[PDB]
RNA sequence: GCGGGGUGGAGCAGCCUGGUAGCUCGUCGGGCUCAUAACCCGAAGAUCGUCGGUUCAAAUCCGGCCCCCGCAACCA
């Protein structure tokens, strides 16, 4: 199963997809039809075995399958992890999912076009979200390349070198790369061997999980003799989960209240290949014996999954510390930031899961928000990522720490 | 073959006979119901014209004229009327249900379908009935209607086992759960509901349950008998009910 | 750093078609 | 996974309940009109997805295999 969360953050169209098919092969479908005409919309997922050539040079001895006689030579090249990726999409809008993805990432690389004005409004937003949330493991990286004036991709590194600068972004090294033609990718595997490193997780804390999607995956008219389970995907961050477990969801479905679902691991899989156990970074999905009508569409999106008799507040009102940003980098327009009123509507992004609030308290940086749907809380060190519907479109404007 | 009980047909009679020699002025037909009896058909009393003057389609007349000197007989198929054209077009289909069976009876019995015809046919010509009638009540109810009418205890058996499909109903329902094992419960109480259900609203061909959308589903009896359908099917949408909610798994027909 | 980069732009420019 | 349709060139009825392939256009020819395909007349042209079975007989009933469009949904 795959080590590890890297996050591919960026404006819209600069190909973030595009550069995980050059590295995995894998596309994210673009479904949905809708997605197939427009773009990514729901989290793209791939995984990919890195090796590297021993018994020749670098970059390009970072291999992608067993196999050294692409360079140099044949001695098979030792395998050094298993990743994964996830794919967000790019459009201004999406931006509440690409937060929510963020809670999984143990990394990131930052994609900017080429060929396009350098701090173009998405790429800014994620970059400060990217700072903002604690993803401090970030490559940036140039892409279409392959279509610009070997003086443009240079001078734009400039203007990169210059912003990665009084930012927190010492030598966020940066990448250019052809993600149409696939060149240069192996020195990219060789940073993201390099600065993207895979975090040690205790296993005997606490079984905790965040869910993005899950499907029904009986197909149109399979019959009732084998229905096959509900199926839940997400990722793991501390804990582990084994087959034949006995768990539960928050904050389960509703009534207005909010109760846990109980289940048992039916099953667990990795990519397209089954396993026993599951650990942290990566996605997972989780087979279980729960009536599929429950996890259709990806109904308990937001919801997050734990050891069964577990310690964990369905909270209704919360108290978060919190700061602002002076801009909001996120509009075209960079309008200064207006403290918060009290009795204002603002969306509370809190792991996955994506929740509406409302201000019940103002202080310097401690305010009680009353929400529509429940939190399970489920530590003390629960990081959050706040916004306001500035001009009919949503924007990040602000974070803090929950409180309990 | 269809043996007949007279020489020659009934002067403006109407029949099925079969085209079987083109020639210049009119053609040869053979007269199906009088031992393929040849007859003469002239063009003035035909009217694209291949198709029905065809080498062997088996049209439909009314006898024009009967020499029952010579011989010879004379049809036409202007002269046929259309409301005849039908009546005389179902009892078709019925007097060649008989031909089959005694054209396989008889080589089964190893005799004649002359046999076949003079002693099933013409004493179940005299119970009142298109024999295969006669028949279709002794198949059901018993071989003592063949015996009866004195029907030579030689074919009775061999007629009547040389004698004796599909309709599809539907529906949408809803399964809602949210049982720790839900899944499970669902192939339970359709298991349970989907029970004994070939021999209460007996035999019918197959059933399918499957799910067309996340609580909607479609159950799906198939059957020989159409009215057997909903029958079978609603009793086992109403079982789905019942031991859904009688087995915590809500179900609810759309 | 730059060196390490520009180094970089270089070897992607000299792929190209 | 069910459907829904498949028919002269085109647009399509006909298929339930089997018995010379129909329309409308277009073509073509001729007609009529002062000139118009405006009308009148004629021809041509679909073995009715595919493969097969039943049938005396099928575009029609029966089933495998295709070709678009609705349903579903990226199916761990
Ligand atoms: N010339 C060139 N075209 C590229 C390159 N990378 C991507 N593209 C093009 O950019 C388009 C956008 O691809 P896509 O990956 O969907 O962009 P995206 O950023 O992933 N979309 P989203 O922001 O929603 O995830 C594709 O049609 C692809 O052809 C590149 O390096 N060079
Ligand atoms: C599903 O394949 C899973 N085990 C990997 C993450 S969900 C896209
Ligand atoms: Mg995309």
Redesign the pocket.
């Given at each position: 199963q795959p080590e590890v969360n890297i996050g591919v953050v960026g404006h819209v169209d600069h190909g973030k997809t595009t550069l995980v098919q050059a590295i995995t092969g894998i596309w994210?479908?673009?479904?949905?039809?809708?997605?197939?005409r427009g773009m990514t919309i729901?989290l793209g997922?791939a995984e990919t075995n890195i090796g590297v050539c021993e018994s020749c040079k670098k970059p390009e001895a970072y291999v992608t399958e067993p196999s050294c006689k692409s360079c140099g030579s044949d001695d098979e090249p030792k395998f050094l992890r298993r990743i994964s990726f996830i794919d967000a999409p790019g459009h201004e809008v999406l931006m509440a999912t690409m937060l929510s993805g963020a809670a999984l990432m143990d990394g990131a690389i930052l994609v900017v076009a080429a060929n396009e004005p350098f701090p173009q409004p998405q790429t800014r937003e994620h970059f400060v979200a990217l700072g903002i949330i604690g993803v401090k493991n970030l490559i940036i990286v140039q892409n279409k390349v392959d279509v610009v004036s070997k003086e443009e991709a240079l001078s734009q590194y400039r203007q990169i070198k210059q912003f990665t600068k009084g930012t927190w972004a010492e030598n966020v090294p940066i990448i250019p790369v052809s993600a149409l033609h696939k060149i240069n990718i192996d020195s990219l595997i060789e940073g993201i061997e390099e600065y993207i490193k895979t975090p040690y997780r205790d296993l005997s804390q606490k079984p905790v999980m965040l869910v993005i999607?899950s499907?029904?995956?009986?197909?149109?008219?399979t019959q009732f003799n084998e229905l096959?389970?509900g199926?839940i995907?997400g990722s793991i961050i501390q804990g582990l989960f084994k087959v034949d477990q006995e768990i539960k969801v928050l904050p389960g479905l509703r009534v207005v209240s909010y109760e846990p679902i109980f289940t048992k691991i039916?099953?667990?899989?990795?990519?397209?290949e089954?396993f026993k156990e599951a650990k942290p970074g990566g996605?997972?999905?989780?087979?279980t014996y729960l009536d599929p009508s429950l996890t259709?569409?990806?109904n308990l999106l937001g919801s997050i999954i734990t050891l069964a008799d577990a310690e964990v507040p369905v909270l209704w009102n919360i108290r978060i510390k919190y700061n602002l940003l002076e801009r909001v980098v996120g509009a075209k327009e960079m309008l200064k930031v207006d403290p918060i009123r009290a009795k204002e509507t603002l969306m509370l992004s809190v792991g996955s899961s994506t929740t509406l609030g409302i201000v019940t308290s103002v202080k310097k940086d401690e305010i009680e928000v009353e929400l529509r749907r429940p939190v399970a809380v489920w530590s003390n060190n629960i990081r959050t990522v706040i916004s306001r519907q500035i001009a009919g479109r949503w924007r990040m404007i602000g974070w803090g720490l929950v409180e309990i | 073959m269809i043996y007949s009980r007279s020489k020659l047909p009934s002067e403006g009679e109407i029949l099925?006979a079969?085209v079987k020699q083109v020639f210049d002025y009119g053609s040869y037909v053979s007269l199906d119901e009088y031992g393929g009896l040849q007859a003469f058909l002239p063009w003035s009393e035909?009217?694209?014209?291949?198709?029905?003057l065809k080498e062997?389609?088996?049209?439909?007349v009314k006898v024009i004229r009967v020499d029952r000197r010579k011989g010879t007989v004379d049809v036409s198929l202007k002269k046929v009327t259309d409301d005849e054209?039908r009546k005389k077009?179902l009892q078709?289909?019925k007097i060649?249900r008989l031909?089959?069976i005694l054209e396989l009876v008889s080589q089964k019995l190893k005799l004649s379908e002359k046999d076949a015809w003079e002693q099933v046919a013409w004493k179940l010509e005299a119970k009142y009935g298109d024999p295969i009638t006669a028949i279709e009540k002794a198949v059901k109810e018993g071989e003592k209607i063949l015996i009866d009418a004195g029907v030579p205890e030689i074919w009775v058996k061999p007629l009547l086992e040389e004698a004796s499909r599909?309709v599809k109903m539907?529906g949408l329902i809803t399964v809602r759960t949210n049982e720790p094992l839900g899944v499970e419960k669902i192939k339970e109480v359709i298991s349970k509901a989907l029970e004994n259900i070939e021999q209460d609203y007996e035999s019918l061909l197959n059933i399918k349950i499957?799910t067309?959308?996340?609580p909607r589903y479609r159950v799906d009896v198939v059957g020989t008998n159409p009215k057997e359908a909903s029958e079978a099917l609603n009793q086992i949408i109403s079982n789905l009910i019942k031991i859904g909610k009688e087995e915590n798994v809500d179900i609810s027909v759309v | 750093s730059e060196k390490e980069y520009v180094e970089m732009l270089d070897r992607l420019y000299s792929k190209l078609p």
């Open positions: 994210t479908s673009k479904h949905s039809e809708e997605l197939k729901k997922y999607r499907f029904d995956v009986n197909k149109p008219g096959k389970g199926v995907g039916s099953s667990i899989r990795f990519g397209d089954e996605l997972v999905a989780i087979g259709k569409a990806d | 099925i079969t035909v009217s694209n014209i291949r198709d029905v062997n389609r088996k049209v439909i054209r077009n078709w289909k060649q031909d089959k599909k539907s499957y067309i959308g996340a | -």
